[PDB]
Amino acid sequence: TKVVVENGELIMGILCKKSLGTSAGSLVHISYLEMGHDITRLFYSNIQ
Amino acid sequence: QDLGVANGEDLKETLTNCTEPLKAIEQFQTENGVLLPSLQSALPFLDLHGTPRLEFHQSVFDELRDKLLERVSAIASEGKAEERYKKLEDLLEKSFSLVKMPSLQPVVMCVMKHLPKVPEKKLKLVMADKELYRACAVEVKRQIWQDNQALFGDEVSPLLKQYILEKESALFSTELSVLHNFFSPSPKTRRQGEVVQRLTRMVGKNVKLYDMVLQFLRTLFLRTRNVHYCTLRAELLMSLHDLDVGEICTVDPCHKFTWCLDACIRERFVDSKRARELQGFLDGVKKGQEQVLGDLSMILCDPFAINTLALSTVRHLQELVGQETLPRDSPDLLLLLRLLALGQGAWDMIDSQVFKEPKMEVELITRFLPMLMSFLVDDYTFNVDQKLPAEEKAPVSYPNTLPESFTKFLQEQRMACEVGLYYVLHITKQRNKNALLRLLPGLVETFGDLAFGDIFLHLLTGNLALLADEFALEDFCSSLFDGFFLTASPRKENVHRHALRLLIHLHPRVAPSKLEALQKALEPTGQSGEAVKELYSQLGEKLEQLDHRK
Amino acid sequence: DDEEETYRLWKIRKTIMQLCHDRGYLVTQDELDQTLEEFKAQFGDKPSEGRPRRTDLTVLVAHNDDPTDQMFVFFPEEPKVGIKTIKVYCQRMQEENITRALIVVQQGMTPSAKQSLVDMAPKYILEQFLQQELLINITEHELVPEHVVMTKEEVTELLARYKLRENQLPRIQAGDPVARYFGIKRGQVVKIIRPSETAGRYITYRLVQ
Amino acid sequence: KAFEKKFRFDYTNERALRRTLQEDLVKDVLSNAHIQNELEREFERMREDREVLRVIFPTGDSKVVLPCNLLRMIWNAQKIFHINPRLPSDLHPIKVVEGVKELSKKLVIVNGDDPLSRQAQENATLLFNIHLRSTLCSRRMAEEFRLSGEAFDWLLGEIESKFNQAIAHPGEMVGALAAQSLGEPATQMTLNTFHYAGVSAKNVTLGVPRLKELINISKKPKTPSLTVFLLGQSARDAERA
Amino acid sequence: QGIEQISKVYMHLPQTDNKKKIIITEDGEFKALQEWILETDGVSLMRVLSEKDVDPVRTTSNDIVEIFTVLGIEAVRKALERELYHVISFDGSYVN
Amino acid sequence: IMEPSIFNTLKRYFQAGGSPENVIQLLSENYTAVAQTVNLLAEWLIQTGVEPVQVQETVENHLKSLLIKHFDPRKADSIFTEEGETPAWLEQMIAHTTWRDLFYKLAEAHPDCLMLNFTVKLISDAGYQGEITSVSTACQQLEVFSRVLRTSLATILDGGEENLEKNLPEFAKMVCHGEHTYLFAQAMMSVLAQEEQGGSAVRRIAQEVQRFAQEKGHDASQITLALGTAASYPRACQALGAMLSKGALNPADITVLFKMFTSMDPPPVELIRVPAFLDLFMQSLFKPGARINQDHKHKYIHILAYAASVVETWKKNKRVSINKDELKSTSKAVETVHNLCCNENKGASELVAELSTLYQCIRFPVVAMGVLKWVDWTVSEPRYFQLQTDHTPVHLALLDEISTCHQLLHPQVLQLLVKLFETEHSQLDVMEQLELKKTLLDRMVHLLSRGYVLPVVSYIRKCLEKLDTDISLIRYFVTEVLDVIAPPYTSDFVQLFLPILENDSIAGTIKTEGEHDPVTEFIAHCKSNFIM
């Protein structure tokens, strides 16, 4: 129950809405800020 | 090699002699060492140490001495008074032979410090030795001083001279400031001076020493005519008050009066309630205790008290003008004048030993004061006329004539002169140049040259700093300097110093022609004092700097 | 009550001292914060027809520099002040040469006297304060940030640096209680330092209108 | 004491420096006293920043919004540059201090050189510079982060770049943006179905009936209140309360 | 007793640290002192602020016009900010 | 006063030669008066002060050691002692051996090996073998350590259960300083415990030493199993060694043990009687949490029952008659108790209901010990006292039952009671806390009723004198004790109960008793007993 994504690879943890949802500091928010914005579009599409 | 003491002298011998008897030396240490069997077994460890056997014993001795000092303090603090005093007396009897030993001298000095009465023989022995006397605490020195008035006077006189010098130097400060003048410090701040604190510590709770100091102050006030001795009397009494010294404050008849006057000085004004309290103190002097009146007059002779009372008198005169009332009908004004009269007559009362209130002259109240009110009245009407619309502006010239009776009052009556001088200071502080020019010719000749006193000149130069822009006018500078300052500067060095200070402060605003004329007129002569020459040199340096700024 | 009256007078005195100090005047340090017992000792502990009555504690203070201008504060005896009462204070001021002054009214001023106060503004300035305004120094409140009056040179520097006019600054009322506390006139930029949770410190400016 | 233990970078200890730094840097720090003076000065600045923060935040919370996520950037530098933080680091703490100062010089909200603009720049990036000093200090970089020199240079570049990207763009329609940012949560808010938990609580009118009273300045609010805080002993006594 | 323009006043001990008195101990650590606070039903500042044993610094209000009459415009800006943040973040939502 | 340096001045006096300027100056270096004598006269001056008591000589020697500690010359200590001389150390150890050499060898202890040797030999020369040992590390040289161990064992064995708490740390800091010394001591314990004529106390002391070893950080369970006969059957002892090296219960390990038990060839029962093993059993079984997975649970219960049930007859190192006819009842009782501790039905809706069955169970000693540990781990949870029936006396009623049905658990019961009494309970009303203390004192009175009195009264006196508790609590204790006891009075009870009653609040004991007389009766009986 402890989500750790490390060096672009999911080490451990189960991703609930607190990991992929609209909460601040989530995986998608950091993917938007650290990576680009086209990359986040690809991220959403691949997940779905 | 005193009582039961081995070699101090043969110790010097032991350091000089140097041949051979080892067993004699060892036996001497055994007999005159730390005579404890328990230490004999512990010494070989010190021998097994390597460091020479001096630092260890010195450290132990110092620790024992400090513990003994702590215990002497504890004995002085704890227990019944008789038992602790007896223990301290026994300890002093056992230890006084070592008073000349530097390592044990602090213990003896502490024991003497905590004793209410040191035996007279030991006190005489201490007095005969300059170093022992110097090392003694003030508590022992009080027991010495109370029965030796000459020695106490020798100790106190430098402080009194220093106090007088400090006051005079404060009167001649380089900075001319209305906000920061001689009367700016609060009484509590003034009592923090080094001389006052040192005198308070020396007197302590001893009434006899306090009376000796009061006698010294009276004698010096009579001999030198310096009012700062009165200032010092007031400050010393109130400094003892601030330390809750009831042994002195309860027996001094001037304590409550001086306290109320100190409050008045702090507020720089005397209200009706405080005036009535001071009057109740004065009227409470019983028949047979009339010398208290001389003491109270000495308190009122304090320049701070005089300044407060005179400023209150001027303010009351202005209020009476506002209220359409005569000076004779105001009891508070009459009371202020009575206090001022006592303060001014202090010297005569003490010198003649005739302790009676000076009679206030009728013509003061009935003539001189309402004429001052007329001067205020002229000022008000001129100010109101200047604000009229231009269509109603008659050519109103300010009244420039000084009545001859006013000048006669300033010349012949001390109280009228004092009140007029403070009125001049008041109008100068208000930047009323017309009234100042009107009254200035009457200050050339005043009662006892009071207009040339250092207090008045200090305040006057400070207030004249507010009229700096008027020094660009040659008529104003001619009036001020030529008609007032230069009339007395050749005969009075202090007037020369005050004029030089004013010129140093205001040279950038003085007209250049008048500036050159004043520089020539204020040139020190061969008989001029060192301070005048120093001030003139400072003025020259400032003038050179100003020329370089062109 | 009599103890309540001396407490109220002491609080008004303390607030007036703090107001004068924050305005930039000569306020003695012990006078700036004195004990209530010290006030009672200095004045009399009986405002009810007694020693610490009004007009006894009219505080006269000068400026820290240029010590000429003074605003010696006024405390009327009556609750409801009028023109014939403020003309006595005008007489006392015209007796002097100083133009600023503060009166501390107990109840509301008569509106005719309110107009009269404006009727001498170019000649000599008079401000008025109710008792409830001076029972709390509002600048000590946590909601009130640090207001500092700016000099004209600093106003010129501000307008030249930001290349904007006095018409464009966010403004402040002349009847603003803080503006009344500092007694600022119209057209006098006030810098305001307040802590911000997003930048640490924020300095805004309020031209007076 | 926790602040001093965590941020001071005690230099007098030998073995701690041996573990945290390489021996050449260890002897460089231990030999020179000018570097020790600079480290003491940066700890002085951090004590000053602590006092400034405690003035700014009287309530004991530190969850504050700032542009550059510095801890995440330090972690990213560690993951990119393959730190292996068991080994002693090889970045000079004086390099850390000077780089932080140069970076604080490089982060510009307000241009100009006159002291008014200098004060504006200081106030605009006061909180962020406090956070930058706190996160990128010498002690933490030597003990709990252990970045390398090239990693530190990349970190400074990344911080500068990501701060320069967060500047408000001239021409942004801020007013409509804020109006929508406030009116969009308005729909998600209740009208008036507050639980009215009767624990005193005065039935504070909350939701839209309160947002409206704030939006149009109502001189007749549904529920006007005070919050009267007691001063001294009366605050800790129910009877005086 | 009391002032006009006010109905029954309710007093309580706070739970959230926004109302709890946050002090700084001599070792620098924050501490939340839970002291009694009052909470009225009317509104009158500059008269409650004048009362004895009332903290004249932290005593805020709920009405804005009353503060504008009492504490000015910038204090009203701060009070409007705090009240707006209160009404927004009551239900756990966040607005920048 | 340069006389005090006759010796070194000597060889520089007869043989000075050359330029004796430094010789004359060092002959002249004592520029003060006879301050050696003046330092002794400081005691005479203190005679007029407060006190230059023998403590004055003690303080002089303390300053001696204070300035000695600078040099404390290890430097030439070996040389000066290899000189084969020096009654200095001998005389100091004869007279001042209290703490001087103690601090000396506590300071550095690496150098001065011969000063240390002389001090240690003089410590050996002292009667009570090891009390001035300048170090608790006196376990290095065997001839000293064996005799010190012998005398300490004699002291403890002559002491008893009361001295078991006072002397055991002072005995275990030596035998646990070194684990080779621990092995030596445990081997001696084993050899002395070979005898059944009083070796039980030796085994108890060995077990306490092993418990202290476990506390301090030893993995001493392997040594304990090596000393025992359990190693004769290898695999079970190896399993125990691993399990006790980990200090936790493994179901696989217990299945390995259980496969070897309950067969026709059981191991000697002394392999399972080790108390740390049973303590780990209690930890893993009767914690309020720590659920056991219902499958090897009966194996746990059977192992505990076999540990605490069976008897044997070692007729010349062989058993011929054992029985297992009561471990079924023991297993049933322990199973019921574990079920009661596992159901944890909220506020004992069931704990109160099955209390009669619990009373039936606690007739057994292992059951009583397990319930005591479970109540210790339940009541001592912070913020527990929020259920209140009569300030929650239910678990304290179980405490009373445990104290009633047995006597060897009384030290643990009193330890739990005083641990709860010393524990300040936050978030409770002050009157509520006071009544909780009253309930605990009622439990202590019940302990006092069943014979276990002297430690309880000793703790009451300790908490009245040292870190003094409320006087009203001691008054209530006296009131409740004297409402139930009266006539005969063994002398020890009177000797311990007199000072707390006669000093410090005589008056509060008697208010409204009347029908049965107050402490006056106890005072009269105390007068009649002793010799005034």
Q: Which candidate in B184, B430, B467 is best for mutational testing of the C interface (most C CBs within 10 A)?
A: B430
Query: Residue D56: its chain C contacts at CB < 8 A?
Result: 195, 197, 200-201
Question: Please, what is the Cα angle at D26 between D21 and D32, to 5 degrees?
Answer: 140
| Orientation angle between helical segments D126-135 and D93-106, nearest 10 degrees | 160
What is the residue type of B174?
Answer: T
Contact between chains at C141 and E47 (C-beta distance less than 8 A): no
Q: Hey, which chains touch F, using 3+ CB pairs under 8 Å?
A: B
Decide if D110 touches C, using CB distance below 8 A: no
d(CA B373, CA B376): 5
The overall longest dimension of chain F from CA atoms, in Å, is: 107
Give A47 to chain D, closest Cα distance, Å: 23
Closest-CA residue of B relative to C89 is B322
- Alpha-carbon distances, residue B26 vs B210, D196, E27 (angstroms): 58, 99, 60
Residue (of F296, F294, F301) closest to F255 by Cα position: F296
Residue E39 forms beta bridges with which residues? E10
The overall longest dimension of chain D from CA atoms, in Å, is: 74
Decide if A6 touches D, using CB distance below 8 A: yes
Reduced to 3 states (helix: H, G, I; strand: E, B; else coil), residue B459 is: helix
B97 contacts F44 by C-beta, under 8 angstroms:
no
The pair of structure tokens assigned to B120 is 């007279």
Interface of B with F in 328-357 (CB under 8 A): none
Alpha helices in B445-492 (DSSP H): 454-464, 474-477, 486-488
The pair of structure tokens assigned to F134 is 């300048």
The size of chain D, in residues, is 241
* Residue D135 CA to its chain's centroid (Å): 9
d(CA F220, CA F226): 10
Residue A12 forms beta bridges with which residues? A4
- Alpha-carbon distances, residue B484 vs B487, B500, B536, F479 (angstroms): 6, 14, 19, 101
Three-state SS letters, D63-116 = CCCCCCCHHHHHHHHHHHHCCCCCCCECCCHHHHHHHHHHHHHHCCCCCCCCHH
Q: Which candidate in B49, B98, B115 is best for mutational testing of the F interface (most F CBs within 10 A)?
A: B49
- Helix, strand and coil content of chain C, in percent to the nearest 5, comes to 35, 15, 45
d(CA B107, CA B95): 8
Q: Which of B28, B56, B60 sits opposite F3 (nearest CB)?
A: B28
Looking only at the bridges linking them, the beta strands covering C146-149 and C190-196 are antiparallel
Decide if D190 touches A, using CB distance below 8 A: no
* Residue D96 CA to its chain's centroid (Å): 18
F72 contacts F107 by C-beta, under 8 angstroms:
yes
- Helix, strand and coil content of chain E, in percent to the nearest 5, comes to 25, 20, 60
Give C79 to chain D, closest Cα distance, Å: 29
Please tell me the number of Cα atoms within 13 Å of B91 on its side-chain side.
32
Question: In this structure, how many other beta carbons lie within 10 angstroms of the beta carbon of residue C174?
Answer: 14
Q: Residue B426: which residues within 8 A CB-CB, separation 6 or more?
A: B311, B314
C117 contacts C123 by C-beta, under 8 angstroms:
no
Q: Which of E46, E58, E69 sits opposite C136 (nearest CB)?
A: E46
Contact between chains at D116 and C200 (C-beta distance less than 8 A): no
d(CA F209, CA F227): 14
Q: Residue B238: which residues within 8 A CB-CB, separation 6 or more?
A: B187, B191, B258, B259, B262
For chains E and B, tell me whether 3 or more CB atom pairs sit within 8 A of each other.
Answer: no
Give E52 to chain C, closest Cα distance, Å: 10
The overall longest dimension of chain B from CA atoms, in Å, is: 122
Question: In this structure, how many other beta carbons lie within 10 angstroms of the beta carbon of residue F13?
Answer: 20
d(CA F43, CA F27): 28
Q: Residue E51: which residues within 8 A CB-CB, separation 6 or more?
A: none
For chains A and F, tell me whether 3 or more CB atom pairs sit within 8 A of each other.
Answer: no
**Exposed/middle/buried for residue C130 (C-beta within 10 Å: 0-12, 13-18, 19+):** middle
Contacts of residues E15-18 at CB distance under 8 Å and 24 or more positions apart, as own/partner, are E17/D59, E17/D60, E17/D61, E18/D59
Contact between chains at D228 and E38 (C-beta distance less than 8 A): yes
What is the residue type of F511?
Answer: K
Q: Is the dihedral of CA B445, B446, B448, B449 positive or negative?
A: negative
Q: Hey, which chains touch B, using 3+ CB pairs under 8 Å?
A: C, F
d(CA B41, CA B36): 10
Query: Residue C197: its chain D contacts at CB < 8 A?
Result: 56-57, 64
Residue (of D213, D136, D127, D128) closest to D162 by Cα position: D128
Closest-CA residue of B relative to F100 is B42
Q: Residue B156: which residues within 8 A CB-CB, separation 6 or more?
A: B199, B202, B213, B216
Decide if C159 touches D, using CB distance below 8 A: no
Alpha helices in B268-302 (DSSP H): 272-283, 291-300
**Which domains occur in chain C, in start order?**
1-136 (3.40.1340.10), 137-209 (3.90.940.20)
Q: Is the dihedral of CA C191, C195, C201, C202 positive or negative?
A: negative
Contact between chains at E17 and D229 (C-beta distance less than 8 A): no
Experimental method: cryo-EM
d(CA F226, CA F232): 10
The pair of structure tokens assigned to A38 is 């086209």
The pair of structure tokens assigned to B367 is 């003539």
Residue (of B41, B24, B46) closest to F9 by Cα position: B24
Tell the residue number behind the tokens 């009897």, with chain if given.
B93
Question: In this structure, how many other beta carbons lie within 10 angstroms of the beta carbon of residue E26?
Answer: 5
Tell the residue number behind the tokens 């009256």, with chain if given.
C5
- Helix, strand and coil content of chain B, in percent to the nearest 5, comes to 75, 0, 25
d(CA C100, CA C127): 8
Contact between chains at F6 and B48 (C-beta distance less than 8 A): no
